[PDB]
């Protein structure tokens, strides 16, 4: 009846006595949620509601030892607060009178981590007392997901779809102050009080629908269901693929039925968390990025820094502009790693390492501070991701801020150039580096209908051998040479073998013993060991294989090239040629999309200039007058002279679809534009746009693609020789 | 001869041999610096130079146990690498032949943390082998501090003064691509090769200058010198105050001034900057009540000027980009959240809006939600307390070449007194209660009338208890408790800074365990307290006579005996009264109102003539006295000049102000074609006539009138906002 020894509990006054059946325990995600609940309960709500804060996430009792389960405090505290007993089973519904509370309301954010907390609570109840799920023991508190204001009255919406109709009707398109309320902490105490008054509109009931619910709860959490989870996630991504392809909606959007089955919870909400590690750790085939990198790169494109900037400052822009959520240290690493250009790192660094960004001596771990190192876009970045193609991408949203796209579409497969690595949940990705110029020539070959050449791994500035050993496996070897009867020289190490690691782990143990001495003659970018041996020891080494003895042999694999296809669905790829083809077809499609976009925009820009120049000409020649005329008078004069409303604005509206006339594009022009040199400059601008339209109409999507490849290679030549000059 | 078992060492080839004296051990600040050095030495440099990376900072052997010093791995590694021996003293110069290296070059960033590393190195060597300091054993590697480009050729500068001189010459005023090279990692491997090619120009020698040096090294690091360090920091701040008042340069700017540097000047001019850094970030300015982190946040908000709410996570990014905030993401979020908190015991005027769960009095603000889910924005009082126009009068600081927050803002009332001030310094600490906004406004008004200010007691917004003077700059804060019947008493208020959850766990809960109470119920909201506690009839009787407030720990005391703050000149000062704070503030702020009138009169008059010309051109075009159609640019400019139009007057005035390629008419000809139409002609003329009145009206206003104007605008909004706060509760 009275709980002793649990201080964080706001025990309901009527809980644990008569009328226990009518009491509800609210488990909240941390203290911030608890305060929200307290605000809503006020004083009059403390009779029939109790609140208890969960520290972190409940233990997964389905895959834990007995010692862990009887010791865990949250579980024992929950059991004591509610009145649960292991010895009971609660098969008879009347047994719920033995409990201090009749219902548990789980109160978390409507997000993946909150989904996980909800799931672990259900897992806890299902594992020990499966019968409880059937009695309506569990429910969740759900806030509205979006609010908007129309004519100073704020309307609230409980599903994304419900918001989506209301915003399509014309009367509701000047909607103002749109806010999303997925997180609990977004709501004020004032709003929290409004919810708890209409408790029933925010109460959602977990309904047990049959044996399918037991399997789902066990599927999501059981230790011995590892492979079924991989199958479970695989089907989620294929079904998501079909939905997007057929134009259908998605299963779940984090909005409210008054009833939710455990089945639909496990397969529609928790799956999103269960798959979240995959979506974050494994790159897209389209551009070779994980979403964290894409956000950094997207921030860079939006800034478009003509001058270099501190990494610490760029990290600020990324957090500001793209909603990066992985924390500052991860963000700095993402920026630094996108700029490294040492042997074993990027073959094309898309960001410039202006400072100590790390070397091959330590594998990039020797980078200097983000408050002292500067970066900026490589001059190759926009040549690989042309700005114009931005107009064809699907940009995502973080609640109401528009951010990076689901992918960029580079002119060649970048996933193959700087490689790809990531461990997911039941999948892993390993993919070596391939030569940029070879991929351009294979793309060029595919455009001419020819046969693509086979592609072997290739690392920029790597001086060793990469040979096929069969079965998508390759043998990477450094360089070692006998110079006299006692000396061998090591001038190259296997790709990804770092100079300090090799020294500590290979050479040093060999001296304490195969070798009698060794000296170092490295630079920051090259390796040179001079190793001394007794004649017999060298002779032995010569007979076992110098590369083997000195551990200058490592192997690369192509047996785990897992990537997201352009539709977000994980897929295993068997050869890089398969990757290059799936990319190639998609990229060629977007060159057609780019030409269609350009034809419309260029034709629109042409009409814009036609009218702009026409006005200036009619003004200088006195056929129209602007002085001391009303805005209403001036607008009608343009209409009767047949000037066109802003054509670029019209075209953009037409694209986005699938007051009165807009002449600001004419009258916002400066007074300067009436002066001789500006009249001449405007006319030239107009005539050039006319040419630009005709010039593009005579080009194929392939011609455009070949154009970009040429511009890329030229700059690649220039930049890469510039690097070699600056090295010695 | 051969060093074994140190894997991180790039031992010099000639080290330990005939040429040990000519070999140099380069100690670097971490691996990143070592890689920089490795790049510069190339291959030919490995004969006479060795490189070893230091993990973190060396132990302060002057205040350590024998076991700690004999166990420390870094120290023993340095000893082995160099050949040092504790039993020796190296008094005789000939003993330097026993060492594997004749010199140690310490290579760190030109910043406070690098200074500290360098100091701990010197402390280590001086403590064990003082004789080594005298022989010139120690030196440091210093990169140029600044590089700038003129006509595509990049020049390097090794001190700020040298740069400032070169930048004074006219030929050399187009400096472009300016970068500061304080940090080692700012330099590329290419640049590192250029330095190490000319090693001598980056070599600085630490010279023992006498007993004066021993005092400095022991002062900086000795355990038994706590009070002397305070004198040393205090004198450093008076010297900075005086130098700044007299217009002199700063003592030290992180560049080489000479080829020789004494241990004396290192400790008292370079290391002191780190030694005082804890003070400078932990303790607020009297002028605006902010620590620099807060100033950076508010500075970011003012520059963004968000008319719409923003996620904290997004604003935190904006602060990091714009203000060079360097304390890490976790510190920044707390700084923002705390600037927006508005519960009992927090700010009496939150300059940021807590749009979401920013924390409650239940947990003292620790129960705020995630930065990705809570939104904030400038309070409508933010610019009324810190008027935008005054920004033109502040001294904006720099993080290398980015302009960042000012050294302080100058609010219309003493903000340090409204939201209090707390901070633990280096031998100083700050504690200050909050005072009532309206009372302080009234006290300012009296001082403007030459009157005597009222005494001010601490006052916390929405706090329902008593705060009474206990004598001696001490105040007594009591919660509120009333007995309602013979077995039951109720607690309806807690002393400020006593949080509802903390009080339950630490006071009431053990009381249920001698033992006083038999049960208690809770009736709190997020913003109010109510405990009902039940007791035996006898237990009440003891407590009622022993003191109900005393028994239930509803008494805490506030102090004004540690009111430490930076005066407007960056110098710490102890203040004995709130009245003293208000007077030093008052005199400074009244000066800045006079500065504001001077600035406005010039800017307004510049803006006024500006419009006079704009209106004149538009009028002369409308009425046909001027033509621009299909006319040459040079023809047009010549017309405007001979008709007496003036070059951009606001640009002229701003250029004249900053002083202490011909005529510019862009302000006229960049006007839109729209500007020739009736409605745009009419509005421009209204703007011109209005700006003239604005100039005439300011001539009739004193600095005090402007201040009183601002005070009125502030109080009106304060009333409106605070009634809305009560209604929305």
UniProtKB/Swiss-Prot annotation, chain A:
The record marks 423 as: Important for DNA bending. It comes from the Eukaryota. Changing residue 35 to L: In BILU; loss-of-function variant in a yeast complementation assay. Mg(2+) 1 binds at residues 29, 109. Changing residue 185 to S: In BILU; loss-of-function variant in a yeast complementation assay. Expressed in the tonsil, spleen, lymph node, thymus, skin, pancreas, testis, colon, kidney, liver, brain and lung. Also found in breast, colon and lung carcinomas, Hodgkin's disease, large-cell non-Hodgkin's lymphoma, lymphocytic lymphomas and seminomas. The active site is at 372 (o-(5'-phospho-dna)-tyrosine intermediate). Mg(2+) 2 binds at residues 109, 111. The record marks 371 as: Transition state stabilizer. Eukaryotic topoisomerase I and II can relax both negative and positive supercoils, whereas prokaryotic enzymes relax only negative supercoils. Key decatenating enzyme that alters DNA topology by binding to two double-stranded DNA molecules, generating a double-stranded break in one of the strands, passing the intact strand through the broken strand, and religating the broken strand. Plays a role in B-cell differentiation. It is linked to Defects in TOP2B may be involved in global developmental delay with autism spectrum disorder (ASD). B-cell immunodeficiency, distal limb anomalies, and urogenital malformations: An autosomal dominant disorder characterized by humoral immunodeficiency with undetectable B cells, distal limb anomalies, dysmorphic facial features, and urogenital malformations. This is DNA topoisomerase 2-beta. The lineage of its organism: Eukaryota, Metazoa, Chordata, Craniata, Vertebrata.
């Amino acid at each position: 009846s009275k709980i002793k020894g649990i201080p964080k509990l706001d025990d309901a006054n009527d809980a644990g006595g008569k009328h226990s059946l009518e009491c509800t325990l609210i488990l909240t995600e941390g203290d911030s949620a608890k305060s929200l609940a307290v605000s809503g309960l006020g004083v009059i709500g403390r009779d029939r509601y109790g609140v208890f804060p969960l520290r972190g996430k409940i233990l997964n009792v389905r895959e834990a030892s007995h010692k862990q389960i009887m010791e865990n405090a949250e579980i024992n505290n929950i059991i004591k607060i509610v009145g649960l007993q292991y010895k009971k089973s609660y098969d008879d519904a009347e047994s719920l009178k033995t409990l201090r509370y009749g219902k548990i309301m789980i109160m978390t954010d409507q997000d993946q981590d909150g989904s996980h907390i909800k799931g672990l609570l259900i897992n806890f109840i299902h594992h020990n007392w499966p019968s409880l799920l059937k009695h309506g023991f569990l429910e969740e508190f759900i806030t509205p997901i979006v609010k908007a204001s129309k004519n100073k009255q704020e309307l609230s919406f409980y599903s994304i779809p419900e918001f989506d109709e209301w915003k399509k009707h014309i009367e509701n398109q000047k909607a103002w102050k749109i806010k999303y309320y997925k997180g609990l902490g977004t709501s004020t105490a004032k709003e929290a009080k409004e919810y708890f008054a209409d408790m029933e509109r925010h109460r959602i009931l977990f309904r047990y629908a049959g044996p399918e619910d037991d399997a789902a709860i066990t599927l999501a959490f059981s230790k011995k269901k590892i492979d079924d989870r991989k199958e479970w996630l695989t089907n989620f991504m294929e079904d998501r693929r079909q939905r997007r392809l057929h134009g259908l909606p998605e299963q779940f959007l984090y909005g409210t039925t008054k009833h939710l089955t455990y089945n639909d919870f496990i397969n529609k909400e928790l799956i999103l968390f269960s798959n979240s590690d995959n979506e974050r750790s494994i790159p897209s085939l389209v551009d070779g990025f994980k979403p964290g990198q894409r956000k950094v790169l997207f921030t860079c494109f939006k800034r478009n820094d003509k001058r270099e900037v501190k990494v610490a400052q760029l990290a600020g822009s990324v957090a500001e502009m793209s909603a990066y959520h992985h924390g500052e240290q991860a963000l700095m690493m993402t920026i630094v790693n996108l700029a490294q250009n040492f042997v074993g790192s990027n073959n094309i660094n898309l960001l410039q390492p202006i400072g100590q960004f790390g070397t091959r001596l330590h594998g990039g771990k020797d980078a200097a501070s983000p408050r002292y190192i500067f970066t900026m876009l490589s001059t190759l970045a926009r040549l690989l991701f042309p700005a114009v193609d931005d107009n064809l991408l699907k940009f995502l949203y973080d609640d109401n801020q528009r951010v990076e796209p689901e992918w960029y579409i580079p002119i060649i497969p970048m996933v193959l150039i700087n490689g790809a690595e990531g461990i997911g949940t039941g999948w892993a990705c390993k993919l070596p580096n391939y030569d940029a110029r070879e991929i351009v020539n294979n793309v060029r070959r595919m455009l001419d209908g020819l046969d693509p050449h086979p592609m072997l791994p290739n690392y920029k500035n790597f001086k060793g051998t990469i040979q096929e050993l069969g079965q998508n496996q390759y043998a990477v070897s450094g360089e070692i040479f006998v110079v006299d009867r006692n000396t061998v020289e090591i001038t190259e190490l296997p790709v990804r073998t770092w100079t300090q690691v090799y020294k500590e782990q290979v050479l040093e143990p060999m001296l304490n013993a195969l070798i009698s001495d060794y000296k170092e003659y490295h630079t920051d970018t090259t390796v040179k060991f001079v190793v001394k041996m007794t004649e017999e020891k060298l002779a032995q080494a010569e007979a076992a294989g110098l590369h083997k003895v000195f551990k200058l042999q490592t192997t690369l694999t192509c047996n785990s090239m897992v990537l997201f296809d352009h539709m977000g669905c994980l897929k295993k790829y068997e050869t890089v040629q398969d990757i290059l083809k799936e990319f190639f077809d998609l990229r060629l499609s977007y060159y057609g999309l780019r030409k269609e976009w350009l034809v419309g925009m260029l034709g629109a820009e042409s009409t814009k200039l036609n009218n702009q120049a026409r006005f200036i000409l009619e003004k200088i020649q006195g056929k129209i007058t602007i002085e001391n005329r009303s805005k209403k008078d001036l607008i009608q004069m343009l209409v009767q002279r047949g000037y066109e409303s802003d054509p670029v604005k019209a075209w953009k509206e037409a694209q986005e679809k699938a007051s009165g006339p807009d002449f600001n594009y004419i009258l916002n022009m400066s007074l300067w534009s009436l002066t001789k040199e500006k009249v001449e400059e405007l006319i030239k601008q107009r005539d050039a746009k006319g040419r630009e339209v005709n010039d593009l109409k005579r080009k194929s999507p392939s011609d455009l693609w070949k154009e970009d490849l040429a511009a890329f290679v030229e700059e690649l030549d220039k930049v890469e020789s510039q690097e070699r000059e600056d090295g010695a």
